[PDB]
Amino acid sequence: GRLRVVVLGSTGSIGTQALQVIADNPDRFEVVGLAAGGAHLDTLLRQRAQTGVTNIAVADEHAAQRVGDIPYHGSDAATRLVEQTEADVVLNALVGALGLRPTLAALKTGARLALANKESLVAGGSLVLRAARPGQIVPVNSEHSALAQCLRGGTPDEVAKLVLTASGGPFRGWSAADLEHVTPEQAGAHPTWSMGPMNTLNSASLVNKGLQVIETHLLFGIPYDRIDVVVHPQSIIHSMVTFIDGSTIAQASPPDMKLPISLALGWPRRVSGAAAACDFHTASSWEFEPLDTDVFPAVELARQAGVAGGCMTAVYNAANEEAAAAFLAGRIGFPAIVGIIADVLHAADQWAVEPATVDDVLDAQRWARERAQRAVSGM
Amino acid sequence: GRLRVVVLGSTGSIGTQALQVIADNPDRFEVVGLAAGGAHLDTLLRQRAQTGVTNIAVADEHAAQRVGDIPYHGSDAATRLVEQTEADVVLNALVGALGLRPTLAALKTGARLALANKESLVAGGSLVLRAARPGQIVPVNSEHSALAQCLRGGTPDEVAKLVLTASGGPFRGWSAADLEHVTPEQAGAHPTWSMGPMNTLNSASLVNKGLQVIETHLLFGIPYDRIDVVVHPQSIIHSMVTFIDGSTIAQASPPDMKLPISLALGWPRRVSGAAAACDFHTASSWEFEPLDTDVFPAVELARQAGVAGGCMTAVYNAANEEAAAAFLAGRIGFPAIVGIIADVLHAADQWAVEPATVDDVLDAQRWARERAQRAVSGM
């Protein structure tokens, strides 16, 4: 009846909007657990008071101490919260490949995994897939939500292509020469979406879209050569499916995460009033343009990593995390992010083996981070 | 397997395109019956020669006099062929009120009815709906085909709005003052070989859209106040569904009637290669803008007629036929088309009774034509 929801990363952008959806719909949903890093205790304490949930995980030990009487604390806290909390839905909105163990714990419980943490699927790969029932993983991001809705337009044998839309980021249309001068402040403001700091930078570099191409292949089982990316600056069309007869089915809404969040939580059932619809009483246009793959090769790199398979997507992601951190610190330039990913991937021969265990995945990421640092040291 | 198809109106635009789809897909379809009026008897006779189908109907006895071996000829030849031919699908691409009895007969056989004939729903209304079983009628029109596909995005209970797109016609954005000066020639009237002069006019006047709104209500059971029209000059998006959560699902394809025809024939199964898909390698935009209902009141009039019910929509359509032909003959100006429809409808409340027979519908149309004629002449 009422779905019991554990919210991991409750204090971030996705987590807060998820709590708002749940608060607006006490008929459909109830929060039963919260996990956070500890960097925003004000927010977390506010959430504790508002939801009445004391079943809480805090990653940072000093922060958990500061609060007092937090039942789960330390780096395995989110995972143990998931293992020990009875739930129908686990919303994983943690950031980074650190969401991997909670993702795997969630799947092992049999709960629906409402997945915002793309990195756990990208890194985990077949390891995560083997742990899931069909339909157990339900994507929270707007692109995959769109695709899931659009796929209802036909049978699986009728699918020709999945078309992912990308905003193009703040630097859409820029030359490679132009990109050399980009600052962390210039890359820090998204034209259409309000997200956390990592998702915002990844949108500017197109790595977000590369990761989403990987997730698409893993979630929906479609070959990489049938996953297209088109640039759509308005971010109103969220993605499309083209069928074998020539028909395309597209999903559209004004950008608002509460829509895909609500659908992921309540899948298959839509949540009335979750978000504003497109308003056709006023003029608008939906524009499409090809991605410039020469200036922005991150999606092509993602495909190459995805095709190689095994632990190579974990390498792609881990290489990004390192180079991105070096960009935000002011150590390397903007175009060095995707350049280092490329350098790491093409040295990553050994990592095409399929992971048997989390340890295999961790091993690949450890290597990639080290190799990424070596690439940074060289510039 | 292979669907047995009867094609009614086989010498028209829809009928000949359907026959192409069928000739291109002998695995999926076989023609088992052909029906035409007799004005293009030669084409019908070529179709018999080409397809090998001898099960043919000709409405015009005079035309039938030319041949000597037509199994069905005279008034109701098409109805009789339907009654006596074993089929899985009847494509009704007949034009005008004479499509109505064949529709009723096709429904009675239990075959799927791929419906192009506008009068069957616009005029026949509750007579047709009471005869049809759920899902029996599959629309051929590109807008209705789009809606049927988009309705796959949720349950019936999840539908908020149906949004039909309209090109806006040749006078899109024109003021009322502009519209005073409209000539027949400008209203897309040419001696075009594949198009009735009324269809281009009905598009220009926005009456075509009004008729599509009525058919939408009847096909999908959505109230008139939840059926919207948006102007979309590119005609790439063929229509859209907005769901209760705020999500909109849209169907997009480059204009080509073989797409909706193939799907109507094969429903629910798509036909591979029916039409070209949208191509995103080249930049494009899809524009939307509201219709000025004050300059173009034809759609609101249609809703008024539809809400009234009974035979009121037959009156709407019949009043248009008279007024539109009167404009084309230079007996009235362009703005007076919808003006006369309004006047006839305001006088027409006796026709809000539900029709018991086809004759009730024909009487409504007779009255509406006579009423419109008086309006045109000043008598």
Ligand SMILES: NC(=O)C1=CN([C@@H]2O[C@H](COP(=O)(O)OP(=O)(O)OC[C@H]3O[C@@H](n4cnc5c(N)ncnc54)[C@H](OP(=O)(O)O)[C@@H]3O)[C@@H](O)[C@H]2O)C=CC1
């Ligand atoms: N934002 C969006 O709209 C979109 C999000 N995504 C995905 O959603 C995920 C998160 O998005 P977003 O909420 O914006 O990111 P945020 O940075 O805004 O939120 C990150 C959350 O994770 C928590 N966290 C950080 N480190 C740890 C840790 N070591 N242990 C436990 N919890 C931790 C933070 O708590 P705290 O900071 O208080 O310590 C915070 O609540 C990402 O993986 C991203 O790819 C996908 C599509 C779009």
Ligand SMILES: NC(=O)C1=CN([C@@H]2O[C@H](COP(=O)(O)OP(=O)(O)OC[C@H]3O[C@@H](n4cnc5c(N)ncnc54)[C@H](OP(=O)(O)O)[C@@H]3O)[C@@H](O)[C@H]2O)C=CC1
């Ligand atoms: N054309 C389009 O793309 C669209 C069509 N529509 C609707 O779909 C319907 C069909 O489209 P379309 O094929 O172009 O129309 P057409 O006029 O091009 O073809 C009409 C068909 O009806 C036949 N016919 C006429 N009278 C009789 C009769 N008494 N008995 C049996 N058959 C008869 C004609 O035979 P003959 O030629 O010998 O007279 C012809 O084969 C139309 O009514 C239209 O309103 C809706 C949207 C777009």
Ligand SMILES: O=CN(O)CCCP(=O)(O)O
């Ligand atoms: O759900 C929302 N997103 O994933 C936004 C992604 C932004 P991008 O299209 O620029 O990567």
